[PDB]
Each structure stands twice: as C-alpha cells, then as structure tokens.
Amino acid sequence: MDGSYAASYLPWILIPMVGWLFPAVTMGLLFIHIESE
Amino acid sequence: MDGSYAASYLPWILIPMVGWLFPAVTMGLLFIHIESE
Amino acid sequence: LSGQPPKFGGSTGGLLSKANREEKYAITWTSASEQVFEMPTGGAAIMNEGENLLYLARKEQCLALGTQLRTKFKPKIQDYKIYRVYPSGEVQYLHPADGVFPEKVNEGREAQGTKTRRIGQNPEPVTIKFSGKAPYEV
Amino acid sequence: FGLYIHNDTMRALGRPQDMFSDTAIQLQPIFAQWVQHLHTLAPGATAPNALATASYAFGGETIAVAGKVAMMPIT
Amino acid sequence: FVFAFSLMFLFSGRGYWQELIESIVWAHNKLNVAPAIQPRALSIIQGRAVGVAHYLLGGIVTTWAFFLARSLSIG
Amino acid sequence: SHSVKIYDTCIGCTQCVRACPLDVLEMVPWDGCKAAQIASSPRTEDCVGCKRCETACPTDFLSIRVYLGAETTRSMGLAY
Amino acid sequence: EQWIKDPLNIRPIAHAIWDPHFGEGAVNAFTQAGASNPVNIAYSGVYHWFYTIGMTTNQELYSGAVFLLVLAS
Amino acid sequence: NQVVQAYNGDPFVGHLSTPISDSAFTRTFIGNLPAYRKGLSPILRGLEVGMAHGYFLIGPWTLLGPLRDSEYQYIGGLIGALALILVATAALSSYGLVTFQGEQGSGDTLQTADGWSQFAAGFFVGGMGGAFVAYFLLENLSVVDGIFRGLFN
Amino acid sequence: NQVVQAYNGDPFVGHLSTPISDSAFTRTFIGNLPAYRKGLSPILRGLEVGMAHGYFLIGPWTLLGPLRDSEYQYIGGLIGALALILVATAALSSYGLVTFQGEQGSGDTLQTADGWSQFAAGFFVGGMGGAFVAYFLLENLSVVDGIFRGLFN
Amino acid sequence: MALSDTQILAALVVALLPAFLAFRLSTELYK
Amino acid sequence: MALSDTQILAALVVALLPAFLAFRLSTELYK
Amino acid sequence: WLTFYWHWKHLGVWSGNVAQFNENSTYLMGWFRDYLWANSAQLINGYNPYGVNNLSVWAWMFLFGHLVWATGFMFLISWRGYWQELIETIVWAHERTPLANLVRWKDKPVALSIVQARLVGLAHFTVGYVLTYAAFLIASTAGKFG
Numbered sequence A, B: 001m002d003g004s005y006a007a008s009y010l011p012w013i014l015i016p017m018v019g020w021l022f023p024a025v026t027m028g029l030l031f032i033h034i035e036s037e
Numbered sequence C: 001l002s003g004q005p006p007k008f009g010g011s012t013g014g015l016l017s018k019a020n021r022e023e024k025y026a027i028t029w030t031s032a033s034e035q036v037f038e039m040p041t042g043g044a045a046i047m048n049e050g051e052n053l054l055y056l057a058r059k060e061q062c063l064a065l066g067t068q069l070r071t072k073f074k075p076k077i078q079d080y081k082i083y084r085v086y087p088s089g090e091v092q093y094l095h096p097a098d099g100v101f102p103e104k105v106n107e108g109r110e111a112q113g114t115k116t117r118r119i120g121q122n123p124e125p126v127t128i129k130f131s132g133k134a135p136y137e138v
Numbered sequence D: 001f002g003l004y005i006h007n008d009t010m011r012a013l014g015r016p017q018d019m020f021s022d023t024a025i026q027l028q029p030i031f032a033q034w035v036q037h038l039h040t041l042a043p044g045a046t047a048p049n050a051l052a053t054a055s056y057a058f059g060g061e062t063i064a065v066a067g068k069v070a071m072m073p074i075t
Numbered sequence E: 001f002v003f004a005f006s007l008m009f010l011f012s013g014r015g016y017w018q019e020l021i022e023s024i025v026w027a028h029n030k031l032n033v034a035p036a037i038q039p040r041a042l043s044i045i046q047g048r049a050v051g052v053a054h055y056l057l058g059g060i061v062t063t064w065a066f067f068l069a070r071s072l073s074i075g
Numbered sequence F: 001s002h003s004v005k006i007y008d009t010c011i012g013c014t015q016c017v018r019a020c021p022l023d024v025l026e027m028v029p030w031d032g033c034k035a036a037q038i039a040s041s042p043r044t045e046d047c048v049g050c051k052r053c054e055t056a057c058p059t060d061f062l063s064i065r066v067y068l069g070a071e072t073t074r075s076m077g078l079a080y
Numbered sequence G: 001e002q003w004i005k006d007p008l009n010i011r012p013i014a015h016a017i018w019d020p021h022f023g024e025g026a027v028n029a030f031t032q033a034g035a036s037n038p039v040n041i042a043y044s045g046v047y048h049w050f051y052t053i054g055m056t057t058n059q060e061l062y063s064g065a066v067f068l069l070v071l072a073s
Numbered sequence H, I: 001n002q003v004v005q006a007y008n009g010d011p012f013v014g015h016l017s018t019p020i021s022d023s024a025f026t027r028t029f030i031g032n033l034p035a036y037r038k039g040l041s042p043i044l045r046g047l048e049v050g051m052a053h054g055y056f057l058i059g060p061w062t063l064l065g066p067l068r069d070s071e072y073q074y075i076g077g078l079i080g081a082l083a084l085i086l087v088a089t090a091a092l093s094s095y096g097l098v099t100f101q102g103e104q105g106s107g108d109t110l111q112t113a114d115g116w117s118q119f120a121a122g123f124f125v126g127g128m129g130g131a132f133v134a135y136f137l138l139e140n141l142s143v144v145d146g147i148f149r150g151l152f153n
Numbered sequence J, K: 001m002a003l004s005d006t007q008i009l010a011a012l013v014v015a016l017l018p019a020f021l022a023f024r025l026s027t028e029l030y031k
Numbered sequence L: 001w002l003t004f005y006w007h008w009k010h011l012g013v014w015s016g017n018v019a020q021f022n023e024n025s026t027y028l029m030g031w032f033r034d035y036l037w038a039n040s041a042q043l044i045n046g047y048n049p050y051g052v053n054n055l056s057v058w059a060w061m062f063l064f065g066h067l068v069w070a071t072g073f074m075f076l077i078s079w080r081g082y083w084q085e086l087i088e089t090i091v092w093a094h095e096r097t098p099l100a101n102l103v104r105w106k107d108k109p110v111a112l113s114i115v116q117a118r119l120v121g122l123a124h125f126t127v128g129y130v131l132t133y134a135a136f137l138i139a140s141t142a143g144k145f146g
C-alpha cells in the first residue's frame, strides 16, 4: 500500500483505527451498555 | 568520560550511585522516617 | 441543628476535605427577612426567612459572618450560634459559650490566662533554662 | 525560561546539536510566520486598493532613507 | 544605586528601624534636640512603597541610560 | 496552641475581645480596675495568633500578650 | 609528580571530571593541564602546601589520605 | 437554563457542578478510568494505568533524547522511560507505606495499604512492559510498516 | 553493659537477643525487607523479591556458564536463569498448595493459601523480567557504557 | 608514580571503617 | 493541483465540529 | 567591597599595570568599567555559539549564581500570606482534580514561615553572592594568568 496523494501516512493509521480501534472501543462500550443493570 | 588514572571503572559506577542511588535511598528512607507515626 | 441552608449558587471557596475528615463549623442564626449577605468564602448568598444553617470550613469564617450579621444589617442579628461539627456526628457548641456575648462581662465566667503581675514582671529565661517552661508559663 | 536554561546548559557542555535553535531542535513560530505571510500577500489579494503592505516588518521591501534602514522584515 | 538602595526598604522591616531611631532619639534627648514631632520608622506599607518606588526608579533609569547612550552611539 | 496571657494592668475597656476574630477572649469579673473586669482567654485552642488583641490594647506596655507556641490545624488557620 | 617538576607552568589538578552530560566540546575543553581526561584545576593551593611540607610522591599523599581515614575513625 | 450548579446539591462544598467537572460525559469517562472504574481490583487498575503511562513515556526520549541521532535511538528512549517507571513505582510504594499505616478503611480498596501496593505492583508491570512493547514496535518499525501496508504479501 | 539478653523477654524461648539477631539495625532492615514489610500485599512483596532474585541470577551463567566463550554469552546466562526462576516459582506454588490446605489463618496475609499464591505470582513476574532487564543491560552494555561516560553527546 | 588499582580499592575498604563508626555515632547522637 | 498535507489535516480538524455536534445530538435524542 | 579591592589591585600588580588601578579606582565607573566589565570578558565567553573552553563551568556558575541570588529576592521581597493564599488555590486545585485527588498529602501544604524564607532568601542571597564572585574571581584571573 503506497500513495502519491498528500498525507499518505493517514491511511496507514486510520485503516487500522476505523478497522480495529473503532470497533473494539465501540462494541466494547456497547457491550457494557446493553448488559448493564 | 575516560581516565588515565587507575580504577577508572570506579567513577563509571560511583557517579550514578552518589548521583542517583544514594539520594533515591536516602530521600526514600527520609520520606518514610519524617512521615511515619 | 435544624435550619434550611441559605440560597447560594455554590462556590469554590467552601468546604474542602478537612470538613469531612477533621472538623467543620456550623453557624445557625434566625433572620426576620429574606436578606442578602456576603459569604465569607467568596460570593453573596441570600438569607432565608427564619432559621438559617450554614456550614463553614473555619471558625474564623463563621465569626467573620457573625461580625457581619451583627453590624452590616439594619436589624442586628444578635442570636447566631456557632458550632463545631465532627464527622462522627458529635457537635460541640462554641459561640457564644455562656449564652452572653464575650465583650459583655458575665458572672459565672472563670478567668483563664490571667497572671496577677505585670508583663515586665515575668521571670528571666536564665532562671528556667532546662525546666522546659516559658517565662509566661512559670 | 527552562528552554533558555536547557540550551544555556547544552551550550556550556559543548552540545550545540541538543539546543533549541535553528541549527538544532527547531521551535519555529509557525502561526506568527503564517500571519506575517498573510500580511505580505495582503496588498492585491485581501487589501486590493492598498498599494503596499501595512508594515514592512511583516515582509517585503527594505526601506532606506540616508543609507540607513527605516524598516526591514523582522524574521 | 537606587536599585540597591531599594533593597534596604524591601528586605528589612520597620521594627528594626524603629528600635534604631529610638537610640538616635536618645542622642537627641541627650542634647535636648529631640523634636516634638516624634521620629517614627516608616509604616509597613510605606516601607514596601518606598522600596518598590526606588526599585522601579533605579531599574528604569538604568535601562533609560543604557538605551539612550547605546542608541545615540550607533548609526 | 498559642498562649494568650492577660496581665494585671488591664483597664477592662473590652477592646481585645471586640478585636478578637476567633472568640478566644471574654470578659470575667475582677476587682483590680475601675471597670471591675479583666480580659480572660479560655479558648486559646482556637487562637490563630494574629495579635489583633494586642493592637487594640491601649495600656502601656500591654495588658494582653499572645505568644506563638505550637502550631495546630486551628492555629495555622487552614480550611484544608 | 608532574606539577613539582615545573610548578610555574603545570596547572595543578584538583580531581577528575566524570559527567555524562559532557559533549565532545567540553571533554576537549576540560582535558587540560597535560591530562588524558577532563579534569578540574585546583585553586585551593594544596599542591603548593604539600610540596612545601616535603611531600613529593603520590604514594605520600595516598598514605596521608589513608592515615586521615584512620584518624577520622 | 443554568448549567453551572452546586456540586452534588450542597452549595457550601468548595466545588462547582460545571460542564467540565460534572457533565454527563465527565461522570462516565472519569468514572470508567482505571483509577475509578467500579469493581476493578487494584492490580488491574495499576496495570491499565501502567500500560498507558509506560507506552508514551519512551516517546520524549526517543525523538528528543541525547541518543536520538545515534544508532541506539530506541534503546536510549527505552532506558530513559524504564528508569522513569522505576522511580515512579518507588514513588508509589513509598507513598503507600506512608499514607496507609495507622488503620485500613473499608469504602475503597485502592485507599488501603494492601490495595495501594497492588496498584504499585500493577503499575510496575504495565509500566515497564508497556514501555517495552512500544520499544519493540519502534525497533521493528520497518516490520510494522510492512505489516500495515502489506509489503509481506 | 550487656548486649546479649533473652529474646523478647522470655529466657526459655530458644533464641537470644544478640547484636546480630535483635539489634535496632536488624529490626529495621529485616522488618523492612519485602517479606516482612508492614502493609504490603503479597503480589508486590512477591514482585520485589522476584525482581531482586531474577536480577543477580543471570550473572553466574553469564560469566561462568558453558556459553560464556561464544557469541551468545548473555543469552545463555538468561536462559539458565529463566528456567531456574521457573523451577523456583514451581517450588513456591507447590509449597502453597501443601502448606495451606486445611485452614486460612487470620494473622498473616502471606501465610495463607491465596496469599502465598500472590507471592508466587509476584515472584514469577519480577523474576523473569528482572532476569530480562539485566539481560537487556548486558546485551546493550556497549550502549550503557556510552551512556554512563557520555559517548553519545 | 601513579597509584595502582589495588591502592584505590584498599582505600575504599579502609573507608568502610569511618563509614561504620559514623553510623554508630549518628545513631548514638540520635538517642 | 493536488491537495497539500496541511489541507488534508485541516479538513480533519474541521471534522471535529460535526463530530462534536453529532455527539451532542445523539445524546440529546437519547434523552 | 574588600575582595573587589583585593582582586583589582592584584590584577594590576600581577600584570604590571598598577596605573590601571591607581587612576580608575578613585571613581566608581572605573570600578564598573575597568574591573567589572573588563575582567568579565573572558568569563562570559566561557561558552559562546563558536565553542567552549576551560572557563565554561565558570561561565555557567557565574550565571548560576546570578539565578540563585535573584531567586532569594523573591523570598525577601514577596512575603508569606501572598503565598499562603496562592497555595490555598493550589490546594483546592489538587483536591478537585480527578486522578490526582486520589493522591493526598500527609503534611498540609503551607507557605514557609516568616523567619524561614528570610533565612531561605538569605541563603539564596549568600549562595548566589559567593558562587557569582568565585566564578568571576577565578575565570578572570585564570583567563589572564592561568
């Protein structure tokens, strides 16, 4: 994965953040919310 | 830091002991002593 | 100690962790009318009609209010009681101690700190060097 | 002030590469340099009827009067 | 001078100075030249007010003399 | 806790009690002056040591004296 | 022993510098008085004091230091 | 209306219920931080505090330390932060010996002598290895870059 | 006068209050060691015992082991002491399964079945990484020497 | 001429004798 | 022609402003 | 005053220029210019943008002693109950800051007492006085003769 466009380091960090960090936080935060008393 | 004098390995270990290990022990032991019941 | 708190919007100058750990101080007074008073911790609050209960961090803040409650209002509030409140629930009643304000002389009050001599008639420190006592003590 | 104390000490220890300077760890005032650039580009673009800049301290011409500088760009 | 003179007022305090004056009042009472207006040390605010006046008078006059002699020499 | 001492040169004009901000001082009956009262200090545990009483004392040298002793939470005047 | 052979020229060395904060400029600046390491120049005058009272070797100064350790004990 | 009120009802406690101090987002983010999260033993409180603190602490010495222009830039950034955590866990354990020595409370496990020592034990383990994993991601940055852009497929 | 007395006042307990066994320096050093320090949880006091023990344990096999004359001297010193700590924590954990099985005393937290297992858990983690940090200081000893004499400035 | 390695190390072992006696004096003066 | 690095990054900084207001609307709609 | 007099008179005696002292010490500008300004030249060039020399530690100590002497002016001019009221805001800030209010002091933070920072400001004044002059005494003499 390369890029001639500017800020090509941004898909280097946002793809594993929207791909992993956003689902792990949100589904983690939803799992506490939907199963709380 | 070099040295033509004998035991030039001694300032290699005594400078970080008098500099760091001596105050972290002493002010560590003083902090327990001046703040104990 | 019954009393509704005065209408205050809150302040950062009030009680710290000392109030729930060591002691705090409660001032209780009765007001004829709903009046505005300057809080000793910063800001202005409104006295409720009837009894007021205010918790303060220091005895000086309660007495700075009690000085203000006695001279900065057209009807003087001369019935304020000042308490020391402990976290264990025990309450020590402080001011006025005998029910009479201390600038007025009252019978039944015993003299503490009186020495029956002049301030220049204190003994020399050389006579009491290793007794540990001060020249004003012995 | 501790930035000043750091490179006072780093220059004293013979470490100019460890200082806070333009030949070392650089602290550029990039927002003030950008504002200076906007004022240099101000005549014509955002001040179209202004012939010259408001001040030459923002950038541009060096003004001489009697072989002596009146105003220069303060970089 | 006036910067250093300020630190007499700033660093000290009047209970030293009142005790010094009442020894000088004695030497005036010895020669019957004690004034009816009793000599007092300056008050605590005035001891600070004189010290902050002489500090800022001394420091600014230094910088004024430094700036004006330097900038008249150059050019 | 500081020591507040009241000496026999008291005239009983009650200015130390009115200058007191910590309710340390009070007027007790006495026989040594015309006002027939002497200042007393029953509550020196609340003494901050600020010496407003010594400022208000009109006698010479002083009839009330505050000696700064051991410092507690109350005498150091801490809200924390 | 190097200083007593030329007291007017050789700078007397107090002790060695051991500072990890030193860069290559300060190592070369403080490698002075004919030493092979960064040193501090003595200004207490103990070299002139020791040479006048008969001390001429580093063995004598070492024997004086060990005796004063014993005298402190 | 008015969004700055008295803190927890009492207007004489020296605090204010501000949109920074007592908002809905403040009460659910601070309260779910490791030092305040309900039900956590202090070994997991200190571990998650340690892993966060150890991870960014090699950063200043990696990019700005004295070894940043040698071949040991990531090594000198690690030893700087490893020795910082060692002072930091010594600051914790000396605090816990001092603060909790006369009696032990019951409301909070963290504010207890055995509880704060679990916090210091967790902070040490997460602090050093959180520094070490970021060191491992920085020495193998050429590996991690090739992972994240698919150079090994 | 006399410096040897009965141990803790009882002359019939089989011990003596000597300048080695019951001096003021002995009671404040032994009593402030991790195994005897007041208020420590067993996970931290296991950790501090482990960190000390893991640190010196690579040293015998580094300088005297069979790999000391190869290019893997520090690795063989580490591998020799990682497996010794693993036997040591197996010795601790099997001891706690044996010694504390009948009842749980209320006196000492360390002398309890869950308490001794926190001690073994701390000794393991401090033992292996204390061996690893001394391994890390030995493989990067050329870096550490250059730090301590300022070769990177 | 110069001191030897065993001379510097012997001075440190001798220096433990004032190190122990200053510890005994300091604890005696604290009592 | 092409966008710069400071144009892509500034678009992200402006994008906090819908992100902050979508958080406020979502919490207001939940209440 | 006396060590300035000793140093400047001996600087002319050692260099042979006794007329430098004898014709400029009669007024305080010659003390200011020919002694304080002139002899500090090699001191303040102990380090510069173009390198260092053996007077680099004395240049750092000279500025160190200026800092310690000027820090003592804070304890001697600013007095206690300014700082006690400042600490009370800092005490409030720690108590109301989450993740930091879990850490609590055992000793209550108060300002230094009235006698104490008169001693502490004097100690900074004296340590600042001595380290300034000992740097200037040595680097001007060793820069000229040493």
Ligand code: CLA
Residues within 6 Å of the ligand: A010, A011, A012, A014, A015, A018, K008, K011, K012, K015
């Ligand atoms: C909803 C519109 C939209 C969609 C469909 C995409 C889609 C994509 N973006 Mg994104 N982007 C958008 C808005 C959008 N973008 C906006 C307006 C910006 C300017 C600030 C960005 C900035 C941006 C960057 C800088 C990056 C991408 C990238 C990408 C790709 C991977 C996802 C990622 O890393 O996100 C990262 C995106 C962000 C951190 C910012 C997105 C902010 C938008 C406005 C949020 C939109 C939320 C949406 C309306 C709600 C949907 C709800 C629904 C799911 C229930 C993918 C092609 C990556 C890429 O190009 O990979 C090759 C990447 O590096 N985008």
Ligand code: CLA
Residues within 6 Å of the ligand: A015, A016, A018, A019, A020, H133, H134, H137, H144, H147, H148
């Ligand atoms: C959009 C999300 C997305 C992306 C970005 C990836 C990307 C990738 N996947 Mg994956 N995949 C995903 C979703 C995604 N996957 C899903 C939805 C599935 C189901 C279809 C799969 C199924 C799949 C399989 C079955 C496998 C992959 C693997 C791979 C990796 C190949 C290289 C490698 O060994 O990585 C190693 C990289 C990682 C394990 C990620 C961790 C790396 C970071 C740097 C560690 C950070 C830790 C640090 C301490 C915490 C940071 C703190 C923070 C505050 C910064 C690559 C990173 C392969 C693999 O080896 O991955 C394990 C593999 O076996 N993928």
Ligand code: CLA
Residues within 6 Å of the ligand: B010, B011, B012, B014, B015, B018, G015, G016, G017, G018, G065, G069, J008, J011, J012, J015
């Ligand atoms: C009180 C006299 C004194 C002074 C001020 C110095 C000063 C110094 N020594 Mg030391 N030294 C001394 C005594 C002295 N020494 C004695 C008598 C010995 C012979 C055994 C040593 C052995 C020695 C070694 C082998 C080393 C130093 C080094 C140094 C330097 C760094 C500090 C250090 O690592 O100490 C380490 C010192 C020791 C481990 C032993 C010193 C023991 C002394 C006697 C303790 C003195 C305590 C004091 C009198 C009590 C007053 C304290 C008071 C301020 C509260 C510094 C120049 C280092 C050096 O040369 O760096 C380049 C170094 O490697 N010294």
Ligand code: CLA
Residues within 6 Å of the ligand: B015, B016, B018, B019, B020, G020, G021, H061, H065, H066, H067, H076, H079, H080, H081, H083, H084, I133, I134, I137, I144, I147, I148
């Ligand atoms: C006399 C004491 C002294 C000495 C010897 C040092 C020495 C040094 N300082 Mg320091 N400094 C000190 C006091 C001192 N400082 C003080 C008083 C200040 C305040 C003015 C500073 C301010 C300061 C700054 C601001 C910085 C330095 C840094 C440096 C280091 C530069 C190289 C490096 O990256 O180190 C890395 C080396 C370490 C962090 C030390 C750890 C190395 C040992 C080997 C780890 C041992 C761990 C082990 C498991 C435990 C041993 C057990 C024991 C029983 C043997 C160097 C070691 C810089 C730096 O990067 O250091 C962090 C830096 O940022 N110094």
Ligand code: CLA
Residues within 6 Å of the ligand: B015, B018, B019, B022, B023, B026, B027, D008, D009, D010, D012, D013, G016, G017, G018, G019, G020, G021, G026, G040, L056, L057, L060
């Ligand atoms: C941030 C930068 C910094 C730091 C922290 C260091 C650190 C140090 N330098 Mg230094 N140096 C620096 C900048 C710095 N320098 C600069 C800019 C220069 C100019 C190039 C120098 C020039 C220089 C020279 C010329 C020398 C050093 C020396 C030293 C070492 C002191 C050895 C010693 O005995 O310490 C112990 C420290 C002390 C005894 C002072 C402590 C005083 C405190 C404040 C008061 C006393 C303690 C108190 C009573 C109670 C505290 C509690 C206590 C009991 C624990 C140490 C490595 C010396 C050296 O190499 O050692 C042999 C030395 O000769 N350096």
Ligand code: CLA
Residues within 6 Å of the ligand: A016, A017, A020, A021, A024, H055, H056, H058, H059, H060, H061, H062, H063, H064, H133, H134, H135, H137, H138, H141, H144
């Ligand atoms: C003086 C200030 C200072 C300095 C100089 C640095 C400098 C550094 N920090 Mg740091 N940091 C600081 C302060 C600072 N920090 C502060 C105050 C914070 C807030 C607490 C942080 C938070 C922080 C984080 C959270 C991260 C950095 C990182 C870094 C490195 C980034 C360099 C880089 O881009 O290349 C190298 C790094 C990259 C190109 C980025 C890679 C990031 C990771 C490996 C990807 C994560 C993947 C995925 C999202 C994780 C999901 C896990 C999965 C299991 C779900 C660098 C060493 C990064 C780091 O340590 O990387 C090891 C990083 O992740 N720092």
Ligand code: CLA
Residues within 6 Å of the ligand: D001, D002, D005, L067, L070, L071, L072, L073, L074, L075, L077, L078
């Ligand atoms: C040069 C002299 C000097 C210095 C150093 C100080 C220092 C300070 N003044 Mg100041 N002040 C001065 C003279 C000085 N004053 C004088 C002359 C007056 C009398 C009128 C005052 C009166 C005064 C007032 C009335 C106020 C201050 C305040 C402060 C603080 C400023 C904010 C701050 O913390 O900055 C950061 C600190 C510094 C810039 C100091 C230098 C720190 C160095 C760089 C750190 C070096 C690392 C360290 C030494 C390593 C430890 C090593 C170990 C061996 C100990 C700071 C503590 C203000 C304050 O406290 O508000 C916050 C305040 O309100 N000052």
Ligand SMILES: CC1=C(/C=C/C(C)=C\C=C\C(C)=C\C=C\C=C(C)\C=C\C=C(C)/C=C/C2=C(C)C(=O)CCC2(C)C)C(C)(C)CCC1
Residues within 6 Å of the ligand: G060, G061, G063, G064, G065, G067, G068
């Ligand atoms: C039988 C007898 C006599 C004969 C004595 C004979 C035949 C010899 C006597 C020799 C003696 C008694 C020598 C004494 C030496 C004392 C010394 C050496 C003390 C030194 C103390 C200090 C504190 C020095 C510290 C220092 C040292 C260590 C240095 O290295 C240099 C720095 C300095 C500080 C100077 C006489 C006829 C009398 C009468 C009858 C009794």
Ligand SMILES: CC1=C(/C=C/C(C)=C/C=C/C(C)=C/C=C/C=C(C)/C=C/C=C(C)/C=C/C2=C(C)CCCC2(C)C)C(C)(C)CCC1
Residues within 6 Å of the ligand: H051, H052, H053, H055, H056, H125, H126, H128, H129, H130, H132, H133, I129
């Ligand atoms: C969102 C948010 C934010 C941000 C955040 C941040 C700041 C971040 C950071 C982050 C971080 C900073 C993180 C960290 C990370 C870490 C990690 C994740 C680690 C891990 C670890 C591991 C992986 C492991 C390790 C180890 C090893 C290797 C071995 C030894 C031991 C151990 C186990 C330890 C804020 C605050 C603004 C607020 C708002 C919200």
Ligand SMILES: CC1=C(/C=C/C(C)=C/C=C/C(C)=C/C=C/C=C(C)/C=C/C=C(C)/C=C/C2=C(C)CCCC2(C)C)C(C)(C)CCC1
Residues within 6 Å of the ligand: H082, H086, H124, H125, H126, H128, H129, H132, I051, I052, I053, I055, I056, I125, I126, I127, I128, I129, I130, I132, I133
């Ligand atoms: C004083 C004294 C003595 C001595 C002592 C000794 C013997 C010492 C030793 C020492 C030691 C023996 C120490 C040790 C050290 C260790 C350390 C300090 C470690 C730590 C660690 C760290 C740093 C970290 C780590 C890690 C990592 C890296 C990762 C993984 C995990 C962990 C976290 C673990 C005696 C007895 C004679 C007695 C008298 C007194």
Ligand SMILES: CC1=C(C/C=C(\C)CCC[C@H](C)CCC[C@H](C)CCCC(C)C)C(=O)c2ccccc2C1=O
Residues within 6 Å of the ligand: E008, E009, E010, E012, E013, E014, E017, E018, E040, E041, E042, E043, E044, E046, E047, E048
């Ligand atoms: C010296 C000194 C004094 C003594 C100063 C006194 C008694 C005042 C001296 C006044 C003299 C008499 C005149 C001062 C100069 C006049 C302003 C000049 C007027 C203009 C002339 C031309 C008439 C204090 O009282 C004092 C109080 C608190 C802190 C510090 C100090 C302090 O440092």
Ligand code: SF4
Residues within 6 Å of the ligand: F004, F016, F019, F020, F021, F022, F023, F024, F025, F046, F047, F048, F049, F050, F051, F052, F053, F054, F066
């Ligand atoms: S010092 Fe203040 S509080 Fe104490 S008795 Fe005097 S006036 Fe009252």
Ligand code: SF4
Residues within 6 Å of the ligand: F006, F009, F010, F011, F012, F013, F014, F015, F016, F017, F038, F039, F056, F057, F058, F059, F063, F064
């Ligand atoms: S001490 Fe002074 S103020 Fe108090 S009663 Fe006596 S004369 Fe009045």
Ligand SMILES: [Ca+2]
Residues within 6 Å of the ligand: H066, H067, H068, H069, H070, I152, I153
């Ligand atoms: Ca470097």
